[PDB]
Design a binder for these strands. Structure first.
Length: 109
DNA sequence: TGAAGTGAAAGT
DNA sequence: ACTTTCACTTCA
């Protein structure tokens, strides 16, 4: 699975709290984006999606690899921003709240 | 304060 | 088809 299909599956699964569809037609989604220095940040919940992508691509096995959620986060961020399959919609990305999240559009084709 | 984050560019 | 690295900035 490429990143677009993989993330579609992760959003649909509802297994990551706050990683969910922004609108009814499922063209837009929210991705939780909590700053890791915050009190209430928990890696097991807040870094789990980034972790999953790293493991899905073989870029982290618990054992060979230092577990660095900051490098998991940047990897997904750079992947999202570089691919023509996605577009960040900063207008509805709400980063000032308690469960802050970014919004992305998924481009079809 | 030092950790965590970033876009841009260089990278495989 | 994404990934890694840089200087520099932003965060709590």
């Amino acid at each position: 699975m490429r990143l677009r299909e993989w993330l579609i599956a992760q959003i649909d699964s509802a297994e990551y709290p706050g990683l969910s569809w922004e609108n009814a037609e499922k063209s837009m989604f929210r991705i939780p984006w909590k700053h890791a220095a915050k009190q209430d940040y928990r890696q097991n919940q807040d870094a789990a999606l980034f972790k999953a992508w790293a493991m899905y691509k073989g870029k982290f096995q618990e054992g060979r690899d230092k577990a660095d959620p900051s490098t998991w986060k940047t990897r997904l961020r750079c992947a999202l921003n570089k691919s023509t399959d996605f577009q960040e919609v900063s207008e509805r990305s709400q980063l000032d709240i308690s469960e802050p999240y970014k919004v992305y559009r998924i481009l079809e084709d």
